[PDB]
Amino acid sequence: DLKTGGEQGYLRIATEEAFATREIIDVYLRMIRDGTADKGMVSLWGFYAQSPSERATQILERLLDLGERRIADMDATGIDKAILALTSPGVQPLHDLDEARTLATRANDTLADACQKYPDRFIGMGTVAPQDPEWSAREIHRGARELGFKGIQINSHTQGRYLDEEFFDPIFRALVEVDQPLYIHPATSPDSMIDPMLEAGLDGAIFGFGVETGMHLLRLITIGIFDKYPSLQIMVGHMGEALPYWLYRLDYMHQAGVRSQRYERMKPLKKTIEGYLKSNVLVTNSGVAWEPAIKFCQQVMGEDRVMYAMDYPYQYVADEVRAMDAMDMSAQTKKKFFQTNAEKWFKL
């Protein structure tokens, strides 16, 4: 009952879909073995790459496939197109810059090859190495102009550092030059923040992912990234990492902080936080196949700014697709949500 081809009145374009390369997963394993992995890596990838559980082993196998098996899984859930990115944390944790750039290059060329082979099914977002912002800028050039990619995905922090630092500016300069979106995907929190979450089993997707990612998007908003770069669009998954829900409180407390001069890095902005959510931020529902949360986001940010995502293979659930197809929404809204918003914002 879930079919490709758009007969139900829209294509299903899934906008937060993951893959891995074996050589990068082997680096994570090396890091865990040699003690250079951070606590988040040990937690996340010591689980996914090593647990014998059904969940981990299926995720690992699915991540590594970029062909007929992934296509079969998409066919079986009626997914027309998938926007693919290297799974978190990509090469961001790597201490050897030459190794990070090499592996990122390879992962990008691997993705490009797959998209060339399945051009009606797979759409690519590039991976970068923000450890090297200037290289990353050139890799943004290459993905947009040579590889056919539609943007980049950054897996939140790089070695405990956030994108609001001036150090990272070449990434933003390059994105606005090629006029492509940035997708800030979660990662585990850095060692400076993870301990109370990790000790309770909360460091991953259940909680810590949202803390890390929402903090990252928020600190970019509050540093004025969209005043510096008014064309820039930043996408986040998981229903906006709670930011839409907190909006009233964000704006109230932002304004209080600005006016009171409480903080060096919180100065006046040209728009409210609400205003940036309406003009510069875009949200997917990855992991949140939940009609009230989706409708809430659509109401707060505008229906044109909210997109369907599956989060394959971390959350591959046919009944979720069925629930999304069944939502109490107009045909027109549902087509935006499943298809045409993604067509617009990713320039498909």
**Residue 135: both structure tokens together:** 């290289």
Q: Give yes or no for residue 250 binding its own copies (CB under 8 A).
A: yes
Least CB distance to its own copies at residue 346 (A): 24
Q: Which is nearer to Mn ion, 8 or 315 (CB)?
A: 315
| Residue 59: partners with Cβ closer than 8 Å, 6 or more residues away | 48, 313, 314
**Residue 152: both structure tokens together:** 């980049």
Residue range at the interface with its own copies (CB under 8 A); choices 66-74, 104-112, 288-296, 331-339: 288-296
Alpha-carbon dihedral 111, 154, 99, 137, rounded to 10 degrees: 90
Q: Give yes or no for residue 318 binding its own copies (CB under 8 A).
A: no
Query: 311 is in the binding site of which of Mn ion, its own copies, none (Cβ under 5 to 8 A by kind)?
Result: Mn ion
Q: Give the interface size with its own copies as a residue count (CB under 8 A).
A: 66
Q: How far is CA 337 from CA 52, 295, 316, in A?
A: 36, 10, 18
Which residues ranging from 30 to 59 are in contact with its own copies (CB under 8 A)?
47, 51, 53-56
Contact with its own copies (CB under 8 A) among 245, 272, 302, 335: 245
Across 134-286, the runs of DSSP E, i.e. the strands, are 152-154, 182-184, 234-236, 281-284
Distance of CA 157 to the CA centre of its chain: 12
What x/- string results for residues 82 through 121 when contact with its own copies is judged by CB under 8 A? Answer: ----------------------------------------
Q: Which is nearer to its own copies, 254 or 271 (CB)?
A: 254
Q: Give yes or no for residue 197 binding its own copies (CB under 8 A).
A: yes
Query: 261 is in the binding site of which of Mn ion, its own copies, none (Cβ under 5 to 8 A by kind)?
Result: its own copies
Amino acid (one-letter) located at 68: E
What x/- string results for residues 124 through 163 when contact with its own copies is judged by CB under 8 A? Answer: ---------------------------------x--x-x-
Give the residue among 223, 137, 125 at the shortest CA–CA distance from 182: 125
Least CB distance to its own copies at residue 208 (A): 9
Distance (Å, whole) CA 203 – CA 209? 7
| Residue 74: partners with Cβ closer than 8 Å, 6 or more residues away | 4, 14, 80, 82, 121, 312
Distance (Å, whole) CA 94 – CA 166? 21
Question: How many CB atoms within 10 Å of residue 219?
Answer: 16
Strand order in the sheet with 122-124: 13-19, 81-86, 122-124
Amino acid (one-letter) located at 117: K
Find out whether 68 is annotated in a ligand binding site. Answer: no
Find out whether 16 is annotated in a ligand binding site. Answer: yes
SS3 183: strand
Query: 117 is in the binding site of which of Mn ion, its own copies, none (Cβ under 5 to 8 A by kind)?
Result: none
Q: Which is nearer to its own copies, 148 or 275 (CB)?
A: 275
* Phi, psi for 310 (deg, rounded to 5): -95, -35
Give 337's DSSP letter: I
Least CB distance to its own copies at residue 44 (A): 10
Distance (Å, whole) CA 206 – CA 219? 21
Q: Which is nearer to its own copies, 7 or 54 (CB)?
A: 54
**Residue 114: both structure tokens together:** 């797959």
Query: 164 is in the binding site of which of Mn ion, its own copies, none (Cβ under 5 to 8 A by kind)?
Result: its own copies
Q: Give yes or no for residue 71 binding its own copies (CB under 8 A).
A: no
Distance (Å, whole) CA 61 – CA 75? 17
Least CB distance to its own copies at residue 151 (A): 24
Query: 54 is in the binding site of which of Mn ion, its own copies, none (Cβ under 5 to 8 A by kind)?
Result: its own copies
Binding site listing for Mn(2+)? 16, 185, 311
Interface residues with its own copies (CB under 8 A)? 47, 51, 53-56, 157, 160, 162, 164, 189-190, 192-197, 199-202, 204-207, 210-211, 214-215, 218-219, 222-223, 238-239, 242, 245-250, 252-254, 256-257, 259-266, 287-290, 292-293, 296, 299-300, 315
